[PDB]
Amino acid sequence: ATQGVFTLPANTRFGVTAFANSSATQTVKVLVNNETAATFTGQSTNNAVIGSQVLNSGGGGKVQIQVSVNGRSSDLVSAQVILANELNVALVGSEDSTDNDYNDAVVVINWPLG
Amino acid sequence: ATQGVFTLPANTRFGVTAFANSSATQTVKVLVNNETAATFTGQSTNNAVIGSQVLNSGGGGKVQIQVSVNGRSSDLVSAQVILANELNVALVGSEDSTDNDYNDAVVVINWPLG
Amino acid sequence: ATQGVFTLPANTRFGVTAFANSSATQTVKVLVNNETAATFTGQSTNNAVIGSQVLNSGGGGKVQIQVSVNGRSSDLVSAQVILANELNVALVGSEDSTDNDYNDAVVVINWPLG
Amino acid sequence: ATQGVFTLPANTRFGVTAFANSSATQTVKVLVNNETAATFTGQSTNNAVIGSQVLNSGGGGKVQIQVSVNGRSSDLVSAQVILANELNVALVGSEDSTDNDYNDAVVVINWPLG
Ligand SMILES: *[C@@]1(O[C@@H]2[C@@H](O)[C@@H](O)O[C@H](CO)[C@@H]2O)O[C@H](CO)[C@@H](O[C@@H]2O[C@@H](C)[C@@H](O)[C@@H](O)[C@@H]2O)[C@H](O[C@@H]2O[C@H](CO)[C@H](O)[C@H](O)[C@H]2O)[C@H]1NC(C)=O
Ligand SMILES: CC(=O)N[C@H]1[C@H](O[C@@H]2[C@@H](O)[C@@H](O)O[C@H](CO)[C@@H]2O)O[C@H](CO)[C@@H](O[C@@H]2O[C@@H](C)[C@@H](O)[C@@H](O)[C@@H]2O)[C@@H]1O[C@@H]1O[C@H](CO)[C@H](O)[C@H](O)[C@H]1O
Ligand SMILES: CC(=O)N[C@H]1[C@H](O[C@@H]2[C@@H](O)[C@H](O)O[C@H](CO)[C@@H]2O)O[C@H](CO)[C@@H](O[C@@H]2O[C@@H](C)[C@@H](O)[C@@H](O)[C@@H]2O)[C@@H]1O[C@@H]1O[C@H](CO)[C@H](O)[C@H](O)[C@H]1O
Ligand SMILES: CC(=O)N[C@@H]1[C@@H](O[C@@H]2O[C@H](CO)[C@H](O)[C@H](O)[C@H]2O)[C@H](O[C@@H]2O[C@@H](C)[C@@H](O)[C@@H](O)[C@@H]2O)[C@@H](CO)O[C@H]1O
Ligand SMILES: [Ca+2]
Ligand SMILES: [Ca+2]
Ligand SMILES: [Ca+2]
Ligand SMILES: [Ca+2]
Ligand SMILES: [Ca+2]
Ligand SMILES: [Ca+2]
Ligand SMILES: [Ca+2]
Ligand SMILES: [Ca+2]
């Protein structure tokens, strides 16, 4: 299945944060309605925050996360959870190699804000 | 039910990060095996990171998140998700008031690291 | 926090299924827009299905699960998961006593159907 | 990423239940520590239960779900959630065609029982 794609309510502010855990530099692209809205780049094997920003889901509500390491697309896994019928958290793990920890870049998207 | 309490594998590094979305200053306490291991304090209505740290689950593996606003405990909601049978993300939402967005402080615990 | 309440898309068929794991007879009430739409009753300590039905979310979309044992409300925990950005599963655990396994009645709500 | 694979605590009873939502007959295989422990077969477009059984995770704790339709592997998505730090629900969605509802067979694994 396609992974890393989430439908948000239209015109809604959301947070996106990425963490790195890999010897390789991670490039995390955040596409909102098929346009790049943010790109986080960084290298850490200690869960450093490599980007954290507030974006707007726009008219189409489509948010997609892509992760690559020196031009090679990482394998993604993702899900969305809703807590108290209100707090939405979408999650993306990514694997740049063969050990399958899926933590090489970890991306958290949350809404609503404020 | 009790919320914000999670059992981790023993002696495992984990990340804990908190975001704020409230006019009130949030205090997030992280207890590892019933002792305070970190405290984050901060204010944002725009999902700012108010703390992000690497901790160790220790012998007992017990992690508890408590959130308060000027000494009053916030109500919590929480869940843990596992992706690719390996990537663990424990989530806490908290509510300091009456609107029930549960985003006043949002806490993300993730493991494994590295 | 309130638990066992979920917003579904309006006028959408959904499945609701309950499993029992308790010496006590479980009563599971499914409220759709604040009116009882189904009630399951049954006893098992082996995860037997005590009810499974298809319902319609109606105009309001509001689905609430309540669990009781001979008139006494069990304590509930819940969350909703979305997989492949399309498959929705809402989950309710319940505790009728003191051991906090939260499995005494387990309720699964899923959509879309068909 | 591989989907439909879950690590359970060793020697623990768990439930596995499958629902069908497709014009095609679904075959769900449950492998426990790499050996076939159950197979459910059925056809429904109305979320009927096509199998529900209690199994034991054995020494290794490895549970894998495979879904096929007339010999062809369906595409899977999955996740595990833990509620109240104790109730575990692993979920599998599957797609046998092109509409990507991922509900064609839906599999719920839960523990602990009793
Ligand atoms: C691996 O190196 C390979 C090279 O061996 C070669 O195959 O060329 C490829 C590029 O095509 C790689 O450069 O690179 C991985 C990152 O791309 C790296 O794994 C990642 O970082 C690790 C620290 C860890 O976080 C892992 O999850 C990440 O995917 C891998 O590092 C090694 O991973 C091992 C487990 O398989 C083990 O942890 C080693 O400690 C760690 O160094 C890396 N392997 C090597 C040998 O360089
Ligand atoms: C000794 C006993 O039967 N305990 C069960 C409990 O009984 C009380 C009874 O002692 C008296 O106080 O009246 C109460 C109602 O007013 C109640 O009947 O009833 C519990 C549920 O109502 C029951 O626990 C449930 O069933 C279990 C088998 C298990 O699935 C539990 O998770 C579930 O909540 C008590 O059963 C015992 O529970 C303990 C754990 O606390 C062990 O599982 C024992 O083996 C059970 O017999
Ligand atoms: C037209 C179509 O897509 N038909 C069903 C499809 O039939 C295939 C047949 O056209 C082709 O030549 O042979 C292949 C096997 O080699 C199929 O037999 O088969 C799939 C299941 O294999 C059906 O889709 C399933 O059942 C549906 C009712 C629904 O639950 C869907 O999610 C599921 O995957 C196809 O059924 C059609 O699906 C469409 C949506 O794509 C609508 O739901 C139609 O009403 C339905 O008939
Ligand atoms: C009247 C007042 O001072 N209310 C404070 C809350 O702020 C208002 O919340 C309401 C919603 O209830 C609404 O958003 C207003 O615009 C706010 O001024 C405040 O709530 C907390 O901060 C909010 C900005 C919002 O994030 C909310 O979810 C959060 O709980 C609480 C905090 O203690 O104080 C109230 O006195
Ligand atoms: Ca890796
Ligand atoms: Ca890694
Ligand atoms: Ca609030
Ligand atoms: Ca808020
Ligand atoms: Ca119980
Ligand atoms: Ca029980
Ligand atoms: Ca389908
Ligand atoms: Ca279908």
Author numbering:
A (entry chain C), B (entry chain D), C (entry chain B), D (entry chain A): 1 to 114
Verbatim from the authors:
Two soluble lectins, LecA and LecB, involved in adherence and biofilm formation have been described in P. aeruginosa. These lectins act as virulence factors through their carbohydrate binding ability. LecA and LecB bind to galactose and fucose, respectively, and their glycan-binding spectra cover a wide range of antigens (ABH, Lewis, P and I systems) present on human tissues or bacterial cell walls. The crystal structure of LecBPA7 was resolved to investigate the incidence of some amino acids changes on the structural organization of the LecB tetramers and sugar binding site.
One crystal of LecBPA7 complexed with Lewisa tetrasaccharide diffracted to 1.75 Å resolution and the structure could be solved in the P21 space group, with one tetramer per asymmetric unit. All of 114 amino acids could be located in the electron density, as well as the 8 calcium ions (2 per sites). The whole tetrasaccharide was clearly visible in three sites, and only one reducing glucose was disordered in monomer D. The structure of the LecBPA7/Lewisa complex was compared to the one previously obtained for LecBPAO1/Lewisa complex. Both structures share the same overall organization with rmsd (root-mean-square deviation) of 0.4 Å over the 456 amino acids of the tetramer. When looking at the binding site, the fucose residue adopts the same orientation in both lectins. No amino acids change involved in calcium coordination or in the hydrogen bonding to fucose was recorded. The other two sugar residues of Lewisa, i.e., galactose and GlcNAc, present a slight shift in response to the amino acids changes and the modified network of bridging water molecules. In LecBPA7, Ser97 (that replaces Gly97 in LecBPAO1) establishes a hydrogen bond with one of the two structural water molecules that bridges between the glycan ligand and the protein surface. The other variation, i.e., Ala24Gly results in an additional hydrophobic contact with the methyl group of Ala24 close to the CH2 group at C6 of the GlcNAc residue.
